[PDB]
Design a protein around this nucleic acid. Structure first.
Ligand code: DG3
Ligand code: MG
Ligand code: MG
Ligand code: MG
Lengths: 662, 105
DNA sequence: CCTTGGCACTGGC
DNA sequence: GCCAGTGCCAA
């Protein structure tokens, strides 16, 4: 076993130079540094470890170091370097599994202060090394009088960078040993720093194997990217902006501008008496003015439909009496209240609809083009959006997606959803050889969490629900039974209910009141009374205070329970997440053993994983048909693997893009 | 004896008046505005003949003030044949207004 | 007591 | 840039 780390001139997307690397070998107990001209020697050392059937440890190596070395080896040395997945270990992946209850800065990409809770120390330091190095580089240059530019600390190699490289491995070594000391994941009988790769995976908890495989697969998915239609979205932006300009024109026509105090520093005091008047706007007594003559500094403010204050001001000035307020001191101004607001003036009443439309218009504009994480700001030169994925970002074992979040794209059945969704598609990728557009294969797990519920309550009802659940579609069967307008509304209803929503909450979901809420709650809870027995057993197991805070996951991991009322959600959402995680891993592995190659220079390419669904680009329709069939086989395999009491299924769709494949 | 202006009456009542008009741009929520109000009520009587005092509430009439770049209230604008002859911001005293008017009249 | 998450937009310091 | 408050978007 060896622990290593590299320093290079840029992020993976544009890295072109290896600066230095460090290797700590457990067999010699020494550190060895490699400078820019020692790249070949560094690479040799890593392969030597692989040749012994050993292990290589990196902190974020799956996403950066490993792929970076492959890219750089070819560019600088004209060498094929490909470390096998089975010989690699990632302390960041391990930390995210073991310390699943805690957040992290995603290697310095996230603001440390905006994150809730505590942060693991060693990992925190590793995530701050780059910014910390930039601080050391900047001051060293300002001491010598030289000027700092853009991000020049990474252009060339220097001994300060080399030092931070050695510190990375010492800290990574420390984090590794801290992780291996967890008896729940690693048996005390075995010294995991003294075993071959095969022993490392076989002796450790199943979760350790699944997390590294998931991270290795998802790193590939990021590198693949999701073919995006820039032109279509740019045209959509022009259409949305035109509608925004018009809505703003009509709205400012109806709701005029006004003045408000701004800039006042001085306290206004009663002239007659003398007591300070804290309610009056702050004044300004000058030195067009006259020394001693007070005045209220004011600003002119134009109506802004994106503000919730201006709308509140204008609507109340028109007669609206707010019913619901926020815990601070502000009336609730959301789409629910706006839809119910009633004034007298017909023009202002009509303006409320323009406001509701404007808010949505802005929502689409911000996500697609103007926001900081907008799609148009994230498209790479290859015409693809390489969204990030934290494989085990959620406490339940689910993944998180960001930069941008490809798991929150507007659904095809929402305003402008078809245009948004159509822009993400395999059709937008033209084959490197033939130039023909690829085909898309979208597969989604059928009624996931409800089947997880069927599994867990099988000890109470003897698999009765598990049999009833596959009597046609569960959501379409519930929709009709509950008298709901859509199947999507049945989904939000059933999960809202299952996870403890109050009567009023269930009413809001279905578009009714607390009365209908109670009816629906007892109607569904009486049909499957084992839900109550399941909830109770969970409580007796977790609460006494806390008898035990975590739940044992399907792969053996500890799944932190945050609150007693969200314990069933922790159990079910974790089961679905781990099932889906093993599912995407098995699917790709089956495809590969069928001769299929993963990559744009191959046969298929993972473009996105959205909880229980995958969108895969396929070179041909024939290949897409197989990806869809293989995904169904992999799901049935997963179910048999963990001896599920409910049959797991998927639904596949072939098409040119996301609007058609989901 | 004050002429209470509106956005729609401003053009004629002020810009076409042919004489001296002192327009007070004010707001009910301003401390200094409430102070200079009673002072104006007297200046209208004393200067009745050589000047006219007018008041425009910026809340009820939001269109006029922006055209004159109002950055503070009360704003005293002395109009002479549709042209701004002198501008003074703040709650001046009876004496300060008296000076200002006589000097610009 | 819906839960897990990302992220846009206003408005204060 | 940071931050608190509010809300919407998806699974
Ligand atoms: N708490 C909660 N979980 C939800 C909600 N919507 C979805 N989930 C969870 C449970 C199902 C899982 C995946 O979402 P899907 O929309 O695929 O749900 P599904 O039940 O598998 O349906 P389908 O057969 O249509 O794919 O995410 C919701 O509104 N609340
Ligand atoms: Mg590193
Ligand atoms: Mg599903
Ligand atoms: Mg889904």
């Amino acid at each position: 076993m060896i622990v290593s780390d590299i320093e290079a001139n840029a992020l993976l997307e544009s890295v072109t130079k290896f600066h230095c690397g460090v290797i700590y070998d457990y067999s010699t107990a020494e550190y060895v540094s490699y400078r820019p001209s020692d790249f070949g020697a560094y690479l040799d050392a890593l392969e030597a470890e692989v040749a012994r059937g050993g292990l290589i440890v990196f902190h974020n190596g799956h996403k950066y170091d490993v792929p970076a070395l492959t890219k750089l080896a070819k560019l600088q040395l004209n060498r094929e370097f490909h470390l096998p997945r089975e010989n690699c270990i990632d302390t960041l992946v391990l930390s995210r599994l073991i310390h699943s209850n805690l957040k992290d800065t995603d290697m310095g990409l996230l603001r440390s202060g905006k994150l809730p809770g505590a942060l693991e120390a060693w990992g925190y330091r590793l995530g701050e090394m780059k910014g910390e190095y930039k601080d050391d580089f900047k001051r060293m240059l300002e001491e010598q009088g030289e000027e700092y530019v853009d991000g020049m600390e990474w252009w060339n190699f220097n001994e300060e960078m080399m030092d931070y490289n050695v510190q990375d491995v010492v800290v990574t070594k420390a984090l590794l040993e801290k992780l291996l000391s967890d008896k729940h994941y690693f048996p005390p009988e075995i010294d995991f720093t003294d075993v071959g790769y095969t022993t490392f995976w076989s002796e450790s908890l199943e979760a350790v194997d699944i997390e590294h495989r998931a991270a290795w697969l998802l790193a590939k998915q990021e590198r693949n990217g999701f073919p995006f239609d820039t032109k279509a979205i740019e045209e959509l932006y022009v259409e949305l902006a035109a509608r925004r300009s018009e809505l703003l024109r009509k709205l400012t026509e109806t709701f005029g501008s006004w003045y408000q105090p701004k800039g006042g520093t001085e306290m206004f005091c009663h002239p007659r008496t003398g007591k300070p008047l804290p309610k009056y706007p702050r004044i300004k007594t000058p030195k067009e003015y006259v020394a001693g003559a007070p005045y209220t500094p004011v600003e002119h403010v134009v109506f802004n439909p994106s503000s919730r204050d201006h709308i509140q001001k204008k609507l109340q000035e028109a007669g609206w009496v707010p019913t619901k307020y926020t815990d601070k001191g502000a009336p609730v101004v959301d789409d629910e209240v706006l839809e119910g607001v009633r004034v007298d003036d017909p023009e202002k009443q009509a303006a409320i609809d323009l406001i509701k439309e404007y808010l949505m218009i802005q929502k689409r504009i911000g996500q697609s083009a103007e926001g900081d994480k907008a799609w148009l700001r994230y498209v790479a030169e290859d015409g693809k959006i390489h969204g990030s994925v934290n494989p085990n970002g959620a406490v339940t074992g689910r993944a998180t997606h960001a930069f941008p979040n490809l798991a929150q794209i507007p659904g095809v059945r929402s305003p402008y959803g078809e245009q948004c969704r159509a822009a993400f598609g395999a059709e937008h990728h033209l084959d490197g050889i033939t130039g023909k557009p690829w085909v898309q294969a979208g597969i989604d797990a059928s009624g996931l969490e409800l089947r997880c519920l069927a599994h867990f309550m099988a000890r109470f009802d003897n698999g009765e629900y598990a049999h009833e659940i596959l009597n046609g579609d569960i959501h379409t069967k519930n929709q009709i039974a509950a008298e709901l307008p859509t199947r999507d509304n049945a989904k939000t209803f059933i999960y809202g209910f299952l996870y403890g929503a109050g009567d009023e909450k269930i009413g809001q979901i279905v578009g009714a009141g607390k009365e209908r809420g109670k009816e629906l709650k007892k109607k569904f809870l009486e049909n499957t009374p084992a839900i109550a027995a399941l909830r109770e057993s969970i409580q007796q197991t977790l609460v006494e205070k806390w008898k035990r805070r975590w739940i044992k996951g399907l792969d053996g991991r500890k799944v932190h329970v945050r609150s007693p009322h969200a314990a069933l959600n922790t159990l079910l959402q974790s089961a679905g997440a781990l099932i889906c995680k093993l599912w995407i891993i098995k699917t790709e592995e089956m495809l590969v053993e069928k001769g299929l190659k993963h990559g744009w220079d191959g046969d298929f390419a993972y473009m996105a994983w959205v909880h229980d669904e995958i969108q895969v680009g396929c070179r041909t329709e024939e290949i897409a048909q197989v990806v869809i069939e293989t995904a169904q086989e992999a799901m049935r395999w997963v179910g048999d693997h963990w001896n599920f009491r409910c049959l797991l299924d998927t639904e596949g769709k072939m098409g040119p893009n996301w609007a058609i494949c989901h | 004896k004050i002429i209470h202006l509106t956005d729609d009456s401003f053009d004629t009542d002020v810009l076409k008046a042919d004489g001296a008009i002192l327009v007070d741009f004010w707001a009910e929520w301003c401390g200094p505005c409430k102070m200079i109000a009673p002072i104006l009520d007297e200046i209208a009587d004393e200067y009745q003949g050589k000047l006219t005092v007018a008041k425009l509430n910026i809340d009820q009439n939001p269109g006029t003030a922006p055209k004159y770049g109002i950055r503070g209230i009360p704003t005293l604008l002395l109009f002479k044949n549709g042209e701004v002859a002198a501008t003074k911001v703040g709650a001046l005293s009876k004496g300060q207004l008296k000076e200002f008017l006589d000097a610009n009249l």
